[PDB]
Amino acid sequence: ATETSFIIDAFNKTNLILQGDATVSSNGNLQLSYNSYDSMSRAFYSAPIQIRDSTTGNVASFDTNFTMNIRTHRQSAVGLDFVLVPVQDTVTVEFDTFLSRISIDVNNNDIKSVPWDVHDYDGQNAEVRITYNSSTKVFSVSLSNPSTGKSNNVSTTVELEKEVYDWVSVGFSATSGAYQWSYETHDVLSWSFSSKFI
Amino acid sequence: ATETSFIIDAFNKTNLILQGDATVSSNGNLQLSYNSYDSMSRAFYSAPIQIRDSTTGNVASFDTNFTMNIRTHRQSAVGLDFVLVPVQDTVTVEFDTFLSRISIDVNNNDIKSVPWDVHDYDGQNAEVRITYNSSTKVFSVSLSNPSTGKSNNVSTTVELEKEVYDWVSVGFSATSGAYQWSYETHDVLSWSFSSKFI
Amino acid sequence: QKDANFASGRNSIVHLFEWKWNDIADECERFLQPQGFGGVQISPPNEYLVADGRPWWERYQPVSYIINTRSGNESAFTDMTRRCNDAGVRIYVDAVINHMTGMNGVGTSGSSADHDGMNYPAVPYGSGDFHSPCEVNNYQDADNVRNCELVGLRDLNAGSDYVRGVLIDYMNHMIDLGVAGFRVDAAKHMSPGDLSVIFDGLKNLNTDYGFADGARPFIYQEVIDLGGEAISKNEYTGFGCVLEFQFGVSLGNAFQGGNQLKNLANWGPEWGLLEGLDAVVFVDNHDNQRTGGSQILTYKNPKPYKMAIAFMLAHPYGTTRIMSSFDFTDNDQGPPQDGSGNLISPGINDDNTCSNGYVCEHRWRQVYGMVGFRNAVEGTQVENWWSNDDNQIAFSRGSQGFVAFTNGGDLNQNLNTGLPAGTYCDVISGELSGGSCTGKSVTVGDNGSADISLGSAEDDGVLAIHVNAKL
Amino acid sequence: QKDANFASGRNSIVHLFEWKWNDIADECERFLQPQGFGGVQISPPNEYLVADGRPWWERYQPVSYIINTRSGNESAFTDMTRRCNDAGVRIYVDAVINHMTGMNGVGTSGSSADHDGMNYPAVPYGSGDFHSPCEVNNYQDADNVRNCELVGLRDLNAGSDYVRGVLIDYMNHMIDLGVAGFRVDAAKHMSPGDLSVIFDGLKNLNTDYGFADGARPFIYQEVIDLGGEAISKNEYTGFGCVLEFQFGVSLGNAFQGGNQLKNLANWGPEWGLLEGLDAVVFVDNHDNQRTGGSQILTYKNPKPYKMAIAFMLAHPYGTTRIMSSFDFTDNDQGPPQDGSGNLISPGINDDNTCSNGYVCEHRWRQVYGMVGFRNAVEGTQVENWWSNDDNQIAFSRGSQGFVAFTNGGDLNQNLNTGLPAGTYCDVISGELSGGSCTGKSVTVGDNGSADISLGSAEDDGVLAIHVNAKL
Ligand SMILES: *[C@@H]1O[C@H](CO)[C@@H](O[C@@H]2O[C@H](CO)[C@@H](O)[C@H](O)[C@H]2NC(C)=O)[C@H](O)[C@H]1NC(C)=O
Ligand SMILES: *[C@@H]1O[C@H](CO)[C@@H](O[C@@H]2O[C@H](CO)[C@@H](O)[C@H](O)[C@H]2NC(C)=O)[C@H](O)[C@H]1NC(C)=O
Ligand SMILES: *[C@@H]1O[C@H](CO)[C@@H](O[C@@H]2O[C@H](CO)[C@@H](O)[C@H](O)[C@H]2NC(C)=O)[C@H](O)[C@H]1NC(C)=O
Ligand SMILES: *[C@@H]1O[C@H](CO)[C@@H](O[C@@H]2O[C@H](CO)[C@@H](O)[C@H](O)[C@H]2NC(C)=O)[C@H](O)[C@H]1NC(C)=O
Ligand SMILES: [Ca+2]
Ligand SMILES: [Ca+2]
Ligand SMILES: [Cl-]
Ligand SMILES: [Cl-]
């Protein structure tokens, strides 16, 4: 099997896949929706990460951090979501700024969601950490604004022992709303991932 | 920048790039030249690894292991080489079974080579370990047959502080000879890599 | 269905974003018509919500179809179609037919709006008339974006006979009043399945306005599709034109400095853009001109923007639409206001600009001069390409016209124009007034081969010349 | 230059690997000719090294050009061209012209060979005549593989006038003796630049053998190119045919069970294979039949192998070459030996096989029966494709012939043949002997539509029928 890992203090298009309005600024930040509305953009690490092993049934416990700075320029439906999208039926932690909910949306059916307020993070840096224990089947998310120390967390039991999942493509999917929810931007400047088997 | 790493106890074509006669058996081993002679095959991890950082000049110290079993079925020119081939001017550690030499061939000019005998490894598993310190500029290779405990090692100072290198594609390049040097095969069943910056 | 419909010998349209009706009329006959203009994409004409602070976006929440807007009631509207249409300026209504409102009750023509209970009496409209509530989750799930509430906005069900009936009545009503087309609002959020049935009840144009007997209504749609999503623009091609959204991004990035102009040689379908005659192209747009850093060019960054719409204009691809926005400093700030009202946009004195908060892009030398350029070259395929294989491009639309430009490198070249030997009054900088050039009086020898000189420091990077500028 | 050259009404060639000259002659007129065969790629005819144990590979280290081999001296050779050529069996010499030897001094015709000092007197040949020493490092460096010593083998310099002179004399000498072509040994290790000049001195064929006046020598080359490498087969296309090496791998993998036969519909250029008339296709080959696990099919695994060469044979692409190897258990074991000598390969009794160590693939029902099939369909494009969208394929070469097969699933179908209504004696299993079928006597109604039945458990997966099998 394949256990993979990486640290990105500064993004570079070279090891990235860009769909829709997804780009990389000279300042080394991944950027989605900066020129679009009512659409969805995405970025994925080149290497297709492996989650389930068919040679044992085993599943990868992945762990991952990433700083991001969501803006709306206004003083999922609209937001930024981390996604485990299979290889060309999607586990997705979504930071929906519009429904104002953080949730683990698996196949359009959120397994657990919790409210959070965008104004507690709009403009500054936010630390997100996703983690999934293969042994206890416990998924967990945490949002926290370092500038103050607010953290909208959440957690749930998710079973990925489904034959259909083996290889996924870890990335980001920032969706953009319409009319006044057209201006939201999505900057991600740090991201680390890590899958593991035993 | 991007520090990358991975452990592959069993290969799978999914996260691999196959050029020439390169494949993957049901037993999970990468295989080159098994159906060819006088030609060169190659396999590379999907993700393009980063060696030099343009934002500081810094260079990645990479470290890496991999078991392999070279056969000739006869009781570089011909052999299996680990290569850091740039992105679509190549540092290459070659296990040439024909000239019977292990060397660090950089731009066709071997920086250091040492003799080794293929019969000390033909048929069984061999542990190779490549390592490059960014701080001391010291490259190093080690071959060792666990079944007995023979190790043909080598080492040299290599400077990769050259603006042209930034992003490479770590892989294997197994070359195959002509006439009686047409039957050599190249099995690789384990491989771990690791780049690092400071 | 995809036919432009302009009064012959004329070319492309304008978005007089938020402008008043009677005002439009003035503009229709005073500036648009004299300049070979196609028409106008008329801002939302039907009764919509009175959202506090009265922002441009309020204009996108239908309270009803009663034709009384902040731009005027029917009287002025009807009038606006009668003056404007006679001038040749075709009117194109923004048809917001996927939802109503997401907030409560204040209709711009006294009609209430009970969001909670899903009631719109002006219509009437009740719960049965709407899709079941749910919201826009994954743009990866096709019926979710179409069948749920885009931004908590009550999603109408264009699948019902009653609802199809009403929308149809609305559009046709407009077709009766004169309009020739409809900038369908958010097609991506509607099943193309009945999007057609609605685009069918529409009876042929009102003969009495000037239209060629039995000519169908131009239908262009809003569908943002820059790949990835489960929805495709092509799904709305078999029955109407779509608004090419990549055009703005790509060509925008190009001139922004994000791409070698040399690459625009194969500008066209080879960039993820549908067949030429399938799109309505545009640079910035009322909505996305709000986004800002990067790719999109708005009047905020003039120079490359003009070269941009110029490349558009000059180039043959799809049908074009310039935009006449109003100055803005927020993202929700409403057009000109005073204790409830839209302030007129006189263009004064006359360098032919505009005042009191309206930018009037269309009245800019560079922009309009190029529109007539477009007219002037019709029926001509792409010919005589050229470049410095970097940021200097040049070519010409047959013996009818020519253009060139540069982001970097004084194009002091010695080129061609492939036109009649003569002289020509550039249109960007200059034009012909009283039989003499007001900017650049260039020469062109006995066989196209002419000399060009466009410097970096200049006001602009572009030079147009065409037989309808020959003195 | 790329023309087959066979005696008309005949098709494709054979590799009688290591067979003796006079023996070839017998085979030429006794079996090859009666069966519509193209010719023979005659094993290396010139003096080469006597490598201990006398392995097939010794045959690839030129000591000299003196025509005395383990297959015979000139007398027998000359004779072999005179009998064999009259029979229509074209001879194709294996031209090893890139190097000499890498080891020392024992020439098969008493000539020495001083490897160390780079001396080959038989010639003569000395250091000046060779490229500078170095070896094959990176197949990524173009001149390195061409200009260095492939496997410590003394690399001749085909760039010199003396060296070009000698090679030219050798080939022409052969052209004088009768041959029509040359299976150039290892073209990838030679600069195409002078590879042409050498392929030019070659004077038109020897009129006195039967050749069409002024016809040039068929030239096909050895170039393994399955991508990645800095060398391409196309570099040797503008002046000669090349041996398609992907053909074996892909089509081999296909039938090995590694790919759906359904995928071979677009079999051809769309698989990384040059223009049809540019290649000499083959399944296994003397060298690569030594590799073993996987992709390559040798007689060691019969069934799918036959279906394979059958698909080849039946299919029109390039020019084909069957291989008649000898049984082997090592990878270096020499053909039949006895204290120095090649033992004859009588085919005996007669089911038309062979004995004492020679496999004689070409004399296999399935293989030869299909060769005549090939002849029988000439000038016919690919027509009437069919499949079970898995491992059952079928089609036919015009009203001239038809074929089908299966790896899995009893093709008990009811198909077409697109031929004259009648009956036909399958060739795989059977043939027509004394006006009656020796295996399958199928019927075909008044318009191609016939019924087929080929079961899994059968001896083979393939059924051929053609007008030259019509009873
Ligand atoms: C990301 O890495 C890429 C690839 O190395 C950088 O692109 C190069 O920039 C260098 C240094 O200026 C140039 O010499 C090359 O011509 C560029 N190559 C390509 C393919 O663009 C890029 O600078 C990096 N981006 C960031 C933000 O560090
Ligand atoms: C993401 O960051 C978390 C939190 O810092 C990491 O978890 C810690 O790693 C630090 C540094 O090695 C340790 O001191 C802590 O013991 C770890 N756990 C906790 C709860 O803080 C984690 O390693 C990171 N994950 C990835 C994939 O980068
Ligand atoms: C490598 O992983 C691949 C992709 O998951 C495996 O291919 C699949 O095998 C599973 C289980 O038999 C099937 O359900 C799928 O249809 C296959 N998918 C594809 C794309 O082939 C493969 O089995 C793995 N190989 C090894 C040696 O473990
Ligand atoms: C390759 O294997 C080597 C040798 O085992 C690894 O180096 C050791 O890692 C082990 C296990 O954590 C430690 O106990 C040792 O201290 C390490 N050093 C030595 C000299 O043994 C190395 O981590 C591996 N590299 C990669 C990229 O997998
Ligand atoms: Ca809808
Ligand atoms: Ca050579
Ligand atoms: Cl629009
Ligand atoms: Cl061959």
Range of the domain at D438: 380-471
> Is there a single domain that holds both residue D231 and residue D330?
yes
> Is there a single domain that holds both residue D320 and residue D408?
no
Close Cβ partners of C198 (under 8 Å, ≥ 6 residues apart): C97, C158, C164, C167, C168, C171
HSE-CB at D94 with a 13 A cutoff on CA atoms is: 23
For residues A128 and A66, the answer to whether their CB atoms sit within 8 Å is yes
> Is there a single domain that holds both residue D407 and residue D369?
no
3-state SS of D280-292?
A: EECCCCCCCCCCC
For residues C278 and C285, the answer to whether their CB atoms sit within 8 Å is no
Residues C88 and D435: their CA atoms lie apart, in Å, by: 87
Residues C102 and C44: their CA atoms lie apart, in Å, by: 17
Hey, how many other C-beta atoms are within 10 angstroms of the C-beta on A63?
17
**Cα D155 to middle of ligand 6, angstroms:** 5
- Alpha carbon distances (Å) from D160 to A43, C207, C368: 57, 87, 71
Residues D145 and D189: their CA atoms lie apart, in Å, by: 5
Close Cβ partners of A190 (under 8 Å, ≥ 6 residues apart): A8, A9, A65, A66, A67
> Is there a single domain that holds both residue D243 and residue D336?
yes
The nearest CA of chain C is from the CA of A103 a distance in Å of: 11
Hey, how many other C-beta atoms are within 10 angstroms of the C-beta on C165?
12
The residue assigned the tokens 């899709």 is C131
Angle (nearest 5°) at CA D384 between D382 and D388:
115
Close Cβ partners of C375 (under 8 Å, ≥ 6 residues apart): C9, C10, C11, C36, C468
Residues A195 and B7: their CA atoms lie apart, in Å, by: 10
What residues of D are annotated to the active site? 185, 222
Q: Which atom of ligand 2 is nearest to the CA of A193?
A: 27
Enumerate residues 195 to 234 of chain C having a beta carbon within 8 A of any beta carbon in chain A: 224-229
Which strands, in side-by-side order, build the sheet including A101-106? A16-19, A39-45, A168-176, A79-86, A91-96, A101-106, A109-115
For residues B81 and B174, the answer to whether their CB atoms sit within 8 Å is yes
Cβ of D150 under 8 Å from any chain B Cβ?
A: yes
The nearest CA of chain C is from the CA of A21 a distance in Å of: 7
DSSP string computed for B50-113: B-B-TTT--B-EEEEEEEEEEE------SEEEEEEEE----EEEEEETTTTEEEEEETTEEEEE
Name the DSSP class of B172: E
**Cα B164 to middle of ligand 1, angstroms:** 10
Task: Provide the residue type at C390 as one letter.
Answer: D
Exposed (0-12), middle (13-18) or buried (19+): which is C353, by Cβ within 10 Å? middle
Hey, which of A7, A192, A195, A196 would you mutate to test ligand 2's pocket, going by the most ligand atoms within 8 Å of its Cβ? A192
Kindly report the protein residue whose alpha carbon is nearest to atom 12 of ligand 3. A54
Q: Which of A7, A50, A53, A54 to mutate to test the interface with B (most CBs of B within 10 A)?
A: A7
Cβ of A45 under 8 Å from any chain B Cβ?
A: yes
- Residue B114 structure tokens: 């040492």
Residues D125 and D133: their CA atoms lie apart, in Å, by: 15
**What region does C44 belong to: left with phi over 0, alpha with psi -120 to 50, or beta?**
beta
Q: Which atom of ligand 2 is nearest to the CA of A64?
A: 27
Hey, how many other C-beta atoms are within 10 angstroms of the C-beta on C456?
12
Exposed (0-12), middle (13-18) or buried (19+): which is B41, by Cβ within 10 Å? buried
Task: Provide the residue type at A73 as one letter.
Answer: H
Q: Among residues A62, A64, A43, A173, which one has the least CA distance to residue A127?
A: A64
D189 annotated binding-site participant: yes
Residues A186 and A33: their CA atoms lie apart, in Å, by: 7
- Alpha carbon distances (Å) from D429 to C326, D68, D397, D433, D469: 85, 41, 20, 13, 13
Interface contact flag, C291 A178, Cβ < 8 Å: no
For residues C198 and C168, the answer to whether their CB atoms sit within 8 Å is yes
Residues D139 and A96: their CA atoms lie apart, in Å, by: 53
**Chain B contacts of D188, Cβ < 8 Å?**
38
Residues A102 and A115: their CA atoms lie apart, in Å, by: 6
**Cα B117 to middle of ligand 4, angstroms:** 26
Bond preceding residue D124 cis, omega within 30 of 0? yes
> Is there a single domain that holds both residue C110 and residue C157?
yes
Angle (nearest 5°) at CA D209 between D203 and D210:
100
Ligand 1 lined by B88 (C-beta under 6 Å): no
For residues B147 and B126, the answer to whether their CB atoms sit within 8 Å is no
The nearest CA of chain D is from the CA of B197 a distance in Å of: 30
Close Cβ partners of B59 (under 8 Å, ≥ 6 residues apart): B51, B52, B53, B134, B160, B161, B197
**Chain A contacts of C330, Cβ < 8 Å?**
75
- Residue D250 structure tokens: 């892909």
Domain CATH number, residue D451 = 2.60.40.1180
Torsion of CA C250, C255, C257, C262, to 10 degrees: 80
Residues A139 and A62: their CA atoms lie apart, in Å, by: 10
Q: Among residues B144, B71, B145, B153, which one has the least CA distance to residue B115?
A: B153
Across the interface, of D57, D135, D294, the residue whose CB is closest to B99 is D135
Alpha-helical regions (H) of D91-154: 142-147
Residues D366 and D181: their CA atoms lie apart, in Å, by: 27
**Where a domain ends, among D333, D355, D379?**
D379
Q: Among residues C230, C265, C216, C224, which one has the least CA distance to residue C247?
A: C224
Domains and CATH numbers, chain A: 1-198 (2.60.120.200)
Interface contact flag, A2 B5, Cβ < 8 Å: no
The nearest CA of chain C is from the CA of A56 a distance in Å of: 31
Angle (nearest 5°) at CA D89 between D85 and D92:
90
> Is there a single domain that holds both residue C349 and residue C395?
no
For residues C48 and C66, the answer to whether their CB atoms sit within 8 Å is no
Hey, which of B6, B8, B192, B195 would you mutate to test ligand 4's pocket, going by the most ligand atoms within 8 Å of its Cβ? B192
> Is there a single domain that holds both residue D210 and residue D148?
yes
Ligand 1 lined by B166 (C-beta under 6 Å): yes
HSE-CB at C31 with a 13 A cutoff on CA atoms is: 27
D327 annotated binding-site participant: no
> Is there a single domain that holds both residue C143 and residue C286?
yes
**Cα A8 to middle of ligand 4, angstroms:** 23
Task: Provide the residue type at B148 as one letter.
Answer: T
Residues D178 and C197: their CA atoms lie apart, in Å, by: 79
Sign of CA dihedral D353, D359, D363, D366: positive
- Residue A78 structure tokens: 């609209």
**Cα C183 to middle of ligand 7, angstroms:** 7
Residues D381 and A72: their CA atoms lie apart, in Å, by: 64
Domain CATH number, residue D255 = 3.20.20.80
Residues C379 and C391: their CA atoms lie apart, in Å, by: 28
Hey, how many other C-beta atoms are within 10 angstroms of the C-beta on B180?
22
DSSP string computed for C326-395: B--SSSS--SS-SSS-PPP----TTSS---TTB--GGGSHHHHHHHHHHHHTTTPPPEEEEE-SSSEEEE
Torsion of CA C356, C362, C367, C368, to 10 degrees: -120
For residues A31 and A24, the answer to whether their CB atoms sit within 8 Å is yes
Kindly report the protein residue whose alpha carbon is nearest to atom 23 of ligand 1. B54
Cβ of D144 under 8 Å from any chain B Cβ?
A: yes
D285 annotated binding-site participant: yes
Question: 3-class SS at C155?
Answer: strand
- Residue A15 structure tokens: 């090891």
Name the DSSP class of D28: I
Query: How many residue pairs bridge chain A and chain C with CB atoms within 8 Å of each other?
Result: 102
- Give the rounded distance of the alpha carbon of B17 from its chain centre: 15
D146 annotated binding-site participant: yes
Hey, which of B9, B12, B23, B27 would you mutate to test ligand 3's pocket, going by the most ligand atoms within 8 Å of its Cβ? B12
- Give the rounded distance of the alpha carbon of D267 from its chain centre: 20
What residues of C are annotated to the active site? 185, 222
Residues D313 and D311: their CA atoms lie apart, in Å, by: 6
**Where a domain ends, among D350, D379, D408?**
D379
Q: Among residues D248, D398, D347, which one has the least CA distance to residue D19?
A: D347
HSE-CB at D249 with a 13 A cutoff on CA atoms is: 20
- Residue D260 structure tokens: 């759906």
Cβ of C328 under 8 Å from any chain A Cβ?
A: no
Q: Which of A9, A11, A13, A15 to mutate to test the interface with B (most CBs of B within 10 A)?
A: A15
The nearest CA of chain D is from the CA of B55 a distance in Å of: 31
Counting as contact any 3 or more CB pairs under 8 A, the partners of C are A
Q: Among residues D156, D171, D188, D146, which one has the least CA distance to residue D62?
A: D156
DSSP string computed for C220-289: EE-----SSSS--GGGGTTTSEEE-HHHHHHHHHIIIIIS-GGGGGG-SGGGT---GGGEEE-SS-TTTT
Question: 3-class SS at B46?
Answer: coil
> Is there a single domain that holds both residue D123 and residue D160?
yes
Residues A67 and A29: their CA atoms lie apart, in Å, by: 11
The residue assigned the tokens 């003195």 is C471
For residues D255 and D264, the answer to whether their CB atoms sit within 8 Å is no
Residues A80 and A95: their CA atoms lie apart, in Å, by: 5
Across the interface, of D151, D186, D291, the residue whose CB is closest to B34 is D291
Torsion of CA C161, C167, C169, C175, to 10 degrees: -140
Across the interface, of A2, A6, A45, the residue whose CB is closest to B3 is A6
Hey, how many other C-beta atoms are within 10 angstroms of the C-beta on D212?
11
C285 annotated binding-site participant: yes
> Is there a single domain that holds both residue C445 and residue C357?
no
Kindly report the protein residue whose alpha carbon is nearest to atom 8 of ligand 1. B54
- Residue A12 structure tokens: 């570079």
Across the interface, of B2, B6, B28, the residue whose CB is closest to A4 is B6
SS3 content of chain C, % helix, strand, coil (to 5): 30, 20, 50
Q: Among residues A41, A37, A52, which one has the least CA distance to residue A17?
A: A41
> Is there a single domain that holds both residue D284 and residue D399?
no
> Is there a single domain that holds both residue D181 and residue D191?
yes
**Where a domain ends, among D352, D379, D406?**
D379
Task: Provide the residue type at B193 as one letter.
Answer: F
For residues D442 and D451, the answer to whether their CB atoms sit within 8 Å is yes
**What experimental approach yielded this model?**
X-ray
- Give the rounded distance of the alpha carbon of A123 from its chain centre: 18
For residues A24 and A12, the answer to whether their CB atoms sit within 8 Å is yes
Close Cβ partners of C377 (under 8 Å, ≥ 6 residues apart): C397, C398, C400, C401, C466
Q: How many independent structural domains does chain C possess?
A: 2
Q: Which atom of ligand 1 is nearest to the CA of A24?
A: 27
Enumerate residues 83 to 122 of chain B having a beta carbon within 8 A of any beta carbon in chain D: 90, 92, 98-99, 105, 108
Residues D364 and C428: their CA atoms lie apart, in Å, by: 81
**Cα C278 to middle of ligand 5, angstroms:** 23
